[PDB]
Amino acid sequence: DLREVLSEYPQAQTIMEEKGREILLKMNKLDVNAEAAEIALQEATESRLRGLDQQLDDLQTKFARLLAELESSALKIAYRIERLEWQTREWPMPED
Amino acid sequence: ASTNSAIINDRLQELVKLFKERTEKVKEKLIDPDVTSDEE
Amino acid sequence: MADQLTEEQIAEFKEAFSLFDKDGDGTITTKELGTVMRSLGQNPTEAELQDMINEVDADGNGTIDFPEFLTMMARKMKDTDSEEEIREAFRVFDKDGNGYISAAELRHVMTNLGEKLTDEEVDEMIREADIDGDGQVNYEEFVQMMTAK
Amino acid sequence: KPKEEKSVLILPPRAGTPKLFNAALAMTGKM
Amino acid sequence: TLYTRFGRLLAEYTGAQQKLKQRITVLETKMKQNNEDDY
Amino acid sequence: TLYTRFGRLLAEYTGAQQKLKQRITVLETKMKQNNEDD
Ligand SMILES: [Ca+2]
Ligand SMILES: [Ca+2]
Ligand SMILES: [Ca+2]
Ligand SMILES: [Ca+2]
């Protein structure tokens, strides 16, 4: 019920969490190094996921170019082949 | 003569964007789950 | 295009068209095309003559009118005017002077333009351009990518 | 109704050699 | 999604590529026989 | 693995395309040279 109410107030969440740190720290219920390991793993993953969001996007932006650099060129050579087919048609067919 | 060097890059300006234009048409037919539903 | 031509050039193209138009009806027939070629010396096939007319004719009805004959000549010499402009700016681009465009040389152009692209996309650019497969773009191919619209 | 997509390629196609144009360029020099 | 494309991109291309090899070869072999008539 | 198989598929296609590009060019150069003779 607090979580739904807090959605309208994003800046108010940060103050309560900061207040939550102080109450835990005064009564020695928060290890900073253990907390930092949770934070560092999350922020490195957050940095990695943003890179992963880039990695998926950088792959997909250049993936479709390879699939389209081939289909355009596969028809250009076939257009050239059809131009080559006119004059070879006048030549007689070989026996074998 | 200065426009001759610029009009080549102006001509190349369209062709480079068309290379990236080829990406989105292939991506559109891929990123749609509807087309993947056709493959199933 | 057609209106850009001088009146003397149109009269010269009319004379060339009138030599091909033996009947004078304003349309070029397949029999007239062979008759002009037979006077020259070669003996082509009638199927090639119809195919040759069909490529020239915009609608492809088998007859070539005078505005169609004027359009192709205007478009052709417009390319040669561009071809005169292409070769001078090709020499400016070709800083090596060997006539072959290397991949590293082409990458110096967009640095002057500010357009940013990956290195392997340039490799895609030169492979689509190249035809003989030597890996370096020559001068006659540089005309092909420029004149094509 | 189904119809062809008709996607225009990047490099415009070239054309075969026109013989009536080849005949025209030949006589011009003599004329 | 990508693995379906890997089959799908190749199936359209390899069928064209399978078509591509015969059409060049018949133009290759017929023109190669012309060289025997040359000399 | 994605980045390696992305790059090597580009490298594999270019190696296959080079063989494709050289053989079609020779066919064009062979038969067009007969047009000038006739
Ligand atoms: Ca006539
Ligand atoms: Ca007509
Ligand atoms: Ca060079
Ligand atoms: Ca070249």
From Swiss-Prot, chain A:
Residues 45-96 form a coiled coil. It is found in: Cell projection, Cilium membrane. Pore-forming subunit of the olfactory cyclic nucleotide-gated channel. Operates in the cilia of olfactory sensory neurons where chemical stimulation of the odorant is converted to an electrical signal. Mediates odorant-induced cAMP-dependent Ca(2+) influx triggering neuron depolarization. The rise of intracellular Ca(2+) levels potentiates the olfactory response by activating Ca(2+)-dependent Cl(-) channels, but it also serves as a negative feedback signal to desensitize the channel for rapid adaptation to odorants. The chain holds residues 449 to 544 of 575 of the full protein. The olfactory cyclic nucleotide-gated channel is an heterotetramer composed of CNGA2, CNGA4 and CNGB1b subunits with 2:1:1 stoichiometry. This is Cyclic nucleotide-gated channel alpha-4. The C-terminal coiled-coil domain mediates trimerization of CNGA subunits. Belongs to the cyclic nucleotide-gated cation channel (TC 1.A.1.5) family. CNGA4 subfamily. It comes from the Eukaryota.
From Swiss-Prot, chain B:
Belongs to the cyclic nucleotide-gated cation channel (TC 1.A.1.5) family. CNGB1 subfamily. It is linked to Retinitis pigmentosa 45: A retinal dystrophy belonging to the group of pigmentary retinopathies. Retinitis pigmentosa is characterized by retinal pigment deposits visible on fundus examination and primary loss of rod photoreceptor cells followed by secondary loss of cone photoreceptors. Patients typically have night vision blindness and loss of midperipheral visual field. As their condition progresses, they lose their far peripheral visual field and eventually central vision as well. Residues 1-11 are annotated as: Calmodulin-binding CaM1. The rod cyclic nucleotide-gated channel is a heterotetramer composed of CNGA1 and CNGB1 subunits with 3:1 stoichiometry. CNGA1:CNGB1 channel binds Ca(2+)-bound CALM1 via CaM1 and CaM2 regions of the CNGB1 subunit; this interaction modulates the affinity of the channel for cNMPs in response to intracellular Ca(2+) levels. The olfactory cyclic nucleotide-gated channel is a heterotetramer composed of CNGA2, CNGA4 and CNGB1 subunits with 2:1:1 stoichiometry. The chain holds residues 557 to 596 of 1251 of the full protein. A motif (IQ-like) lies at residues 12-22. This is Cyclic nucleotide-gated channel beta-1. The gene is CNGB1. Signal peptide: none annotated. It is found in: Cell membrane; Cell projection, Cilium membrane.
Curated annotation (Swiss-Prot), chain C:
One of its GO terms (molecular function) is calcium-dependent protein binding. The modification N6,N6,N6-trimethyllysine is found at residue 116. Residues 77-149 are annotated as: Necessary and sufficient for interaction with PCP4. (Microbial infection) Inactivated by S.flexneri OspC1 and OspC3 proteins, which specifically bind the apo-form of calmodulin, thereby preventing calcium-binding and activity. It is found in: Cytoplasm, Cytoskeleton, Spindle; Cytoplasm, Cytoskeleton, Spindle pole; Cytoplasm, Cytoskeleton, Microtubule organizing center, Centrosome; Cell projection, Cilium, Flagellum. Ca(2+) 3 binds at residues 94, 96, 98, 100, 105. It comes from the Eukaryota. Ca(2+) 4 binds at residues 130, 132, 134, 136, 141. Keywords: Acetylation, Calcium, Cell projection, Cilium, Cytoplasm, Cytoskeleton, Disease variant, Flagellum, Host-virus interaction, Isopeptide bond, Long QT syndrome, Metal-binding, Methylation, Phosphoprotein, Repeat, Ubl conjugation. The modification N6-acetyllysine is found at residues 22, 95. The modification Phosphothreonine is found at residues 45, 111. The modification N6-methyllysine is found at residue 116. Gene3D superfamilies: EF-hand. Ca(2+) 2 binds at residues 57, 59, 61, 63, 68. The modification Phosphotyrosine is found at residues 100, 139. Changing residue 141 to G: In LQT14; decreased calcium affinity; loss of CACNA1C calcium-dependent-inactivation; no effect on intracellular RYR2-mediated calcium release. This is Calmodulin-1. It comes from Homo sapiens. The gene is CALM1.
UniProtKB/Swiss-Prot annotation, chain F:
Residues 1-38 form a coiled coil. It is found in: Cell projection, Cilium membrane. Pore-forming subunit of the olfactory cyclic nucleotide-gated channel. Operates in the cilia of olfactory sensory neurons where chemical stimulation of the odorant is converted to an electrical signal. Mediates odorant-induced cAMP-dependent Ca(2+) influx triggering neuron depolarization. The rise of intracellular Ca(2+) levels potentiates the olfactory response by activating Ca(2+)-dependent Cl(-) channels, but it also serves as a negative feedback signal to desensitize the channel for rapid adaptation to odorants. The C-terminal coiled-coil domain mediates trimerization of CNGA subunits. The olfactory cyclic nucleotide-gated channel is an heterotetramer composed of CNGA2, CNGA4 and CNGB1b subunits with 2:1:1 stoichiometry. Belongs to the cyclic nucleotide-gated cation channel (TC 1.A.1.5) family. CNGA2 subfamily. This is Cyclic nucleotide-gated channel alpha-2. It comes from Homo sapiens.
